[PDB]
Amino acid sequence: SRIGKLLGFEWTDLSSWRRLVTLLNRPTDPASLAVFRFLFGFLMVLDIPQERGLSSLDRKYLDGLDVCRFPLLDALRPLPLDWMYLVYTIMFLGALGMMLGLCYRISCVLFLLPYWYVFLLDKTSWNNHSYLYGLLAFQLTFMDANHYWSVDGLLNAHRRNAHVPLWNYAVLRGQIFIVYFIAGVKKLDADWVEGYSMEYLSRHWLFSPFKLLLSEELTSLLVVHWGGLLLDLSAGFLLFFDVSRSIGLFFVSYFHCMNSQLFSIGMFSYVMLASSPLFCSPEWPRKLVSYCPRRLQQLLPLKAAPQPSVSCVYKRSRGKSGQKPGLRHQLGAAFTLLYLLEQLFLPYSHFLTQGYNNWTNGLYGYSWDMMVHSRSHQHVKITYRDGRTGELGYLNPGVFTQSRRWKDHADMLKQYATCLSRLLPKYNVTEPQIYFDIWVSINDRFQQRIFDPRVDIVQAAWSPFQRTSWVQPLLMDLSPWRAKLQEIKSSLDNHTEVVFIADFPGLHLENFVSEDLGNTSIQLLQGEVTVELVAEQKNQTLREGEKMQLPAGEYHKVYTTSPSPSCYMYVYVNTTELALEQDLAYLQELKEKVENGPTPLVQTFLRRQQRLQEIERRRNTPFHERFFRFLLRKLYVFRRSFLMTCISLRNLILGRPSLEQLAQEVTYANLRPFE
C-alpha cells in the first residue's frame, strides 16, 4: 500500500457506494472529539454574555422606543424584553449542557434554535465568527461527542469510551479546510496582493523583530499581505499531512496568537486554536494522560480498551463478513457529501442573489473574506419632501437606527426608508419622499456616491434576484491615481487637510463652507467642472490644473459638465484651531519663562497634559493593575447580566411587581461591587 498512510485510505474504497459507506463509518477513538466539544462549550458559555449582547438586551429592546430593525425577513419580529431574556437563558442552559455532556441532544438543540433565531433577527450584526459558531453547533448536534470525558457516560454504561463513525472527524476537518482555503482564495484580490487593504497594521510593536532586517514598506507588503495569503493558502495542506504537522501547528498557533491581540474579534482566535488538534491522531489525549507522572495517573478515569458501539460498523476478515448498511449508516455519508458541497458552493453563490450585490458582492457574513475591503465615509444627507404641502426638510443621519451598516447596502436602505415612512407621521409629517446622498471611498480611493440621489427609495423597486438600478457603479478606471493621491497627501503640512472627490456627469454637489474654515481652495485634476457661488450667483468654468479660492460661511455648488467622471480636491485649514494653538503656545511659553525667572483655552492644555502624564504613568505601571481592572470589568458585566436575567425571570414567572421595587432592583443591579 503506497498511498495507505499519506491519505488514510485506498483507491479501491471509492469504487462503489457500499464501499464508500463502509469507509466513512469506520470506528474511531472519540477522545479528541470530546476535548473539542468541551472547549467549544466552555468558549460559548464565556462568549454569550459578552458578544451576543445579553448585558445590553434592556438597552436594545426597550418596551416603547422607536427603532428601525433590519431582519432578513420582515415577517420575523422580536418579542417583549422578558421573553428575549428567557430565550437568552435557554441558550445559556443549552451551551452549559453541551459543555458538560449532560443531555447532549437536548442541550444541542436548545442552543441551536435560539442562536439561529437571534442571528436571523438582525442583518447588521453578521460576521464570520458568528456564522462559524452556528455552523459548528449545527454539526455537533448530529455527532456522538459524549462518548468520552462526559457526564452522560458517568451515569450511563454504554457511553463510556465507545466508538464513533469516521465521518465525525471528516466533517470538522473539511469545515476547517474550507474555511482556510476559501479565505486564502478570497485574498487573491488586487487590493490585497498590492498591499492596500492593511497599510497601517505593520506599525504595531508586535512587528518589531521584522523591522530589524526589513523596511517599513517591505515589512508591510511582504509580511502582513503576502505572508498572510501564503499561510491562509497552505495551513490546511500543512496540517493534514503528518510529515509537516508540527511545523504547520507551530505556524497556525503563532498566527492565531498574534491575531488574538492585533484585533478584537471575540473568541475567534481561541476557537481556531482549539480546532487545530483535531487534525492530529484521534487518540492524543490518551497518550498525553499516559505521559504524565504516575502520581497523577490514578485519579483520572482508567485507560482501557474502548467498548463496541452501535453507531459505527465493524468490518473484519474473521469477525463475520458484512453488515448491510441501514438508514443510519448511509445517512451519515449523504449528510457529509451534501454538507461539504453546500459549504463549498455557498461563498460563490453571488450570481444568483443579484439584489444583494453592491460594490462588494453579497451580504457580509458568510463568504470568508476578512479585512479585504475597508470603507471610509465622508458625508450622509437625508432629505424628505412633504406630500401634503411640499416643504423640504432634513433628517439626522440615523435617528432611529442602532447601527451604521445601512449606508452600504440597498436592502437595508430600503428597509430604513420604509421605517421612516411609517414613523414620520408621528411628527406632523404627511406621506414623505426620502432621498439619500452618501459619499463612500473604499480602499483609499476617490470619494464618490454609492446611491442615486434623484430616486425616491420608498417607491423604488428592489428584488432579491434582480440587479438594483439605483446603485452607482464603482469607478474602476481610477485606481492607478492612488500613488499620486498618497504623494499629494504626504506633501502637505501638519495642519492642512485634503479630500479627493470624484463626480458623475449630470450631478452636482451643494456644500456649505464653515465660517472657521479659512483658506479653502479647490483644484481640478481631470475633466472639467463649473464652480458656482450661491450668494452672488456667479459661475466659473475650470479646467485641468486650475485652482480657485472659495469664501467661508457661504454656499457654493460644483457642477460636472464633462461626459466623463471628473476628480478634484478640497484643500482647507482650520484657522480657528491655528489661532487658538498659537495663542495657547504664547500664553504657555511666556508664562513658563516668567515663572522660571481656569479659562477653557488653558483648560484644554491642562487636560492634555494630565492625559499625557496618566498615559506615561500607566506605561510605567506594570501590567498587573491593568489585568486586575480587566477582570473587574468582566466580573461587573457578568454580574449585571445575571441580575437582570434573574429580575426578568422573576417578573415573568411570579408576576409584575409595583414600580418602586423595580427601580430599587435596577439600581442595585449596577453597583460596581468593589474597586
Binding site: 479585512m371 471610509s376 444627507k381 432634513y394 474654515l517
Partner: peptide
C-alpha cells in the same frame, strides 16, 4: 427625540466625520 435639523447643518461636507476607531465589519461592535 428631534429628528430634524437645519439646512446649513445638513450640508457641511467638510467636517470632522466621526471615525469611531477602525470599526471594521469583522469587529465585535
Amino acid at each position: 427625540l428631534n429628528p430634524f435639523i437645519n439646512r446649513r447643518n445638513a450640508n457641511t461636507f467638510i467636517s470632522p466625520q466621526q471615525r469611531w476607531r477602525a470599526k471594521v465589519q469583522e469587529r465585535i461592535r
